[PDB]
Amino acid sequence: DLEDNWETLNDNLKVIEKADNAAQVKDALTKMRAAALDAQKATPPKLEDKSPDSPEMKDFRHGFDILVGQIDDALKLANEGKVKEAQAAAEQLKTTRNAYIQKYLKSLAAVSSMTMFSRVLGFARDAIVARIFGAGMATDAFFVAFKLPNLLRRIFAEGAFSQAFVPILAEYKSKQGEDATRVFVSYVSGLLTLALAVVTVAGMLAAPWVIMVTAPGFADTADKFALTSQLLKITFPYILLISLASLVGAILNTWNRFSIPAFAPTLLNISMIGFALFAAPYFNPPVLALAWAVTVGGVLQLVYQLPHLKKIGMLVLPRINFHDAGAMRVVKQMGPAILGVSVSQISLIINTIFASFLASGSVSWMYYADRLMEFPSGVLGVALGTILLPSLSKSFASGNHDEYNRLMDWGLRLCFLLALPSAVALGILSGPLTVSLFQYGKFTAFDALMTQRALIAYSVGLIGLIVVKVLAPGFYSRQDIKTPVKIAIVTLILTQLMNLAFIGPLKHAGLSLSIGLAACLNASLLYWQLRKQKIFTPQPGWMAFLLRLVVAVLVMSGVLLGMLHIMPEWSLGTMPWRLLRLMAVVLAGIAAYFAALAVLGFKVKEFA
């Protein structure tokens, strides 16, 4: 393992610095030479996608080549008896380790998205929007208006184009030479811009009909329709903006740094927060600012990535003139994908339909609770997507079931171990979180209470969602298995029946608990299809493990309730003090969970 070789070299380093004899020094330098050579063989986490001969791997190995050369100099020094000069070479090895190899140990999922800074900015945007005018009918209008184009970007930008554009661009980059890829991208971007322009123009023009079909209950309230349609007209261009930005993102991912495309969400965040502060007094009604803030943000996301595109010689001159020839090579991939992609959106439309006939603020409460949940979902998602998912990718590509099965069982253990706590911990600290983050002027306690009743309901979906993240790769890895679509269609029918049942008793929390239970049902159907297809057979010993995890989670839950009872009201004080009481309770509950685990026959060794 590369991590095994890495901790080996580190341990040997600290041994060299505290050494007394030339034998003790020559031995450690010798082992470090062997270990550096052997570490040259792993495909580092930042390059898991890359082939073992591409210049990225070449650069990785060259860093280690310099490492071994320095260790050879140090072995020569130690052979001449120069204990101090050998130690000097040892302490200067770290410079090479930091310069050439350290940029390759970052995770692909971590480099790809969600730096802590951008996360904090997104939370600041949600808190700022709530404080100036959140949880009203205005924010209901805006949130509906905002989600409506975010459904359409899934069919154009992220879903069908990841199905189609991402592999074909690599093919062109390798087999077809560099220059043809330019023209290829020219026509792809051209036809995309055209079809997106058709969509945005039609959507702006027919926006009232769109709101009818989406959220018809608003005509019960007075003026709700006019605001929602005006906001939708304002925010519809955003898809033509963000799909192009996504395309440029993927291209800049293929060639150069993955981080610049990841910054782009921060531009929407920044635009929204500044626009809300400095423009909301200017617009009447004021929610308009937000809507402009969206579109104003979108432009920036695009125009931020264009300059870097120039350097890699990929600045598109979007040519629309190949209606027949340029389209098909990518539109064939789109055709099979659009079924699974479109069905999924239909359900979320129907969920906003259900939410229209409720009380003013139901949509906004649901949205703020969704915004709270997004944080652990992303965190757990990326953590599991660097630890386990790449290893499963390898063990599917090469070896047969046995290894792949043992890996997948360890991963299914890990899913519960990391998600079940987080789920129930957010259940407990729902109240503290919503009040501390969102209680400010125009956000009453009632709004935080309803958002809390939705956060309880959304919590259940956390574990099911991450288990889906684990299990879906197994089917997508099989080249022609297209069942997930069937599982998704079943999930959406079940979701609509659950809402029917849950709306009466539970109001908007019913529609939220239905999504939470639906994620677990998606995971359960993928699992039952993973074990009835004979792809995987569960390892033995879960019953004891599950009971241990139950006890540890119950421990953490007990500590959280005890600390909460001590705590003062979560309204006392300003935002910093409320959030520093929350950090107290959070860190305490987390440390208590790990303490329980350690006492409950669990490991503590942590690496990377």
**CA nearest neighbour of 466 among 380, 339, 342:** 380
Given 72, 106, 140, the domain boundary residue is 106
Q: Which residues, 6 or more positions from 599, have their beta carbon under 8 angstroms from its beta carbon?
A: none
Among residues 53, 77, 106, which one ends one of the domains?
106
Which of 253, 273, 4 has its CA nearest to residue 126? 273
Kindly compute the dihedral angle of the four CA atoms of residues 199, 205, 210, 215, in this order, to the nearest 10 degrees: 130
Residue that terminates a domain, selected from 106, 140, 159: 106
339 and 485 Cβ atoms separated by less than 8 Å: yes
| Residue 559, CA distances (Å) to 376, 459, 462, 585, 604 in order | 20, 19, 21, 9, 20
Cβ proximity of 318 and 193 under 8 Å: yes
The DSSP-derived string for 459-501 is HTHHHHHHHHHHHHHHHHHSTT---HHHHHHHHHHHHHHHHHH
Which residues lie closer than 8 Å to 344 by C-beta, 6 or more apart? 154, 488, 492
Find the DSSP H helices in 18-54: 22-39
Supply the angle between the helices 22-39 and 55-79 in degrees, to the nearest 10: 170
Helix (H, G, I), strand (E, B) or coil at 536: coil
CB-count exposure of residue 593 (10 Å: 0-12, 13-18, 19+): buried
- Name the token pair of 260: 């610049």
443: helix, coil or strand?
Answer: strand
The full DSSP string for 359-422 is: -TTHHHHHHHHHHHHHHHHHHHHHHHHHHTHHHHHHHHHSS-HHHHHHHHHHHHHHHHHHHHHH
CA 481 to chain centre: 25
Same domain assignment for residues 177 and 95: no
Q: Count Cβ atoms within 10 A of the Cβ of residue 1 and give its class: 0-12 exposed, 13-18 middle, 19 or more buried.
A: exposed
- Taking the C-alpha atoms of residue 146 and residue 159, their distance in angstroms, rounded to an integer, is 19
Contact 271, 300 (CB under 8 A): yes
Cβ(537)–Cβ(400) below 8 Å: no
φ, ψ for residue 443, nearest 5 deg: -115, 110
Q: What is the rounded CA–CA span in Å between residue 134 and residue 539? A: 49
Terminal-residue alpha carbon distance, the chain: 12
Query: Of 228, 276, 288, 294, nearest to 132 (Cα)?
Result: 276
As a whole number of angstroms, the distance between CA 255 and CA 171 comes to 13
Contact between 426 and 373 (Cβ < 8 Å): yes
Q: In b/e form, how buried is each residue of 160-176, taking b as 16+ CB within 10 angstroms?
A: bbebbbeebbeebbeee
Q: Which long-range contacts (CB under 8 A, 24 or more apart) does 209-218 make?
A: 210/148, 211/144, 213/349, 214/144, 214/148, 214/349, 214/352, 214/353, 214/356, 215/144, 215/352, 215/353, 215/355, 215/356, 215/363, 216/353, 216/356, 217/356, 217/357, 217/358, 218/140, 218/141, 218/356
Distance CA 70, CA 5 (A): 17
Residue 534 DSSP label = T
> And the tokens for 597?
């685990």
- Shared domain for 112 and 9, answered yes or no, is no
- Which residues, in sequence order, are CB contacts of 23 under 8 Å at separation 6+? none
- Please check whether residues 548 and 586 belong to one and the same domain: yes
Q: Where are the alpha helices (DSSP H) in 44-103?
A: 55-79, 83-96
How many beta carbons lie within 10 A of that of residue 408, not counting itself?
Answer: 26
Residue at token pair 């500044």: 274
378's tokens: 């992303």
Q: Are 465 and 414 in the same domain?
A: yes
Indicate the number of domains in the chain: 2
Distance CA 455, CA 433 (A): 10
Rounded Cα distance between 277 and 128, Å, is 8
Nearest 5 degrees, angle CA 404-CA 409-CA 411?
95
- Considering the domain architecture, whether residues 155 and 9 belong to the same structural domain is answered as no
- Same-domain pairing of 247 and 273: yes
Find out whether 172 and 180 touch, Cβ atoms under 8 Å: yes
CB 495 within 8 Å of CB 515: yes
Beta-ladder partners of 440: 443
DSSP state of 570: T
Instruction: Give the span between the Cα atoms of 350 and 505, in whole angstroms.
Output: 19
Does the N-terminal peptide bond of residue 432 adopt cis geometry, omega within 30 degrees of 0? no
* Cα dist from 63 to 32, 58, 75, 87, 272, whole Å: 15, 9, 19, 21, 43
Phi-psi category of residue 573: left, alpha or beta, with phi > 0 → left and psi -120 to 50 → alpha: left
Same domain, yes or no: 458 and 337: yes
C-alpha neighbours within 13 Å on the C-beta side of residue 576 = 0
Whole-angstrom Cα distance, residue 184 to residue 191?
Answer: 11
Q: Which residues contact 83 (CB under 8 A, 6 or more apart)?
A: 19, 20, 21, 22, 25
DSSP letter (8 states) at residue 41: T
Q: Copy the structure tokens of residue 97.
A: 């380790």
SS3 at position 604: coil
Using CA atoms of 41, 47, 49, 54 in order, give the dihedral in degrees to the nearest 10.
-70
Q: Read out DSSP for 120-146?
A: HHHHHHHHHHHHHHTTSHHHHHHHHHH
Query: Quick one: 501 and 542 in the same domain?
Result: yes
For 64, the domain range is 1-106
Q: Are 451 and 368 in contact (CB under 8 A)?
A: yes
> How many whole angstroms separate alpha carbon 288 and alpha carbon 309?
33
Report which DSSP code applies to 538: P
Distance (Å, rounded) from C-alpha 16 to C-alpha 24? 8
Beta bridge partners of 19: none
Instruction: Name residue 543's amino acid.
Output: M
Phi and psi at residue 491, in whole multiples of 5°? -60, -40
226 with 291, same domain? yes
Distance CA(513)–CA(460), nearest Å, equals: 7
Element (H, E) at 166: helix 159-174
Would you give the DSSP letter of residue 114?
-
Rg of the chain (C-alpha set): 27
Clarify whether residues 123 and 92 are in a common domain: no
For residue 140, how many C-alpha atoms fall within 13 Å in the half-sphere facing its CB? 27
| 531 membership: H or E segment, kind and range | helix 508-532
Give residue 531's identity as a one-letter amino acid code: R
Contacts of 149 (CB under 8 A, 6+ apart): 203, 232, 235, 236, 238, 239
- In this structure, the answer to whether residues 175 and 100 fall within a common structural domain is no
Q: Same structural domain for residues 20 and 127? A: no
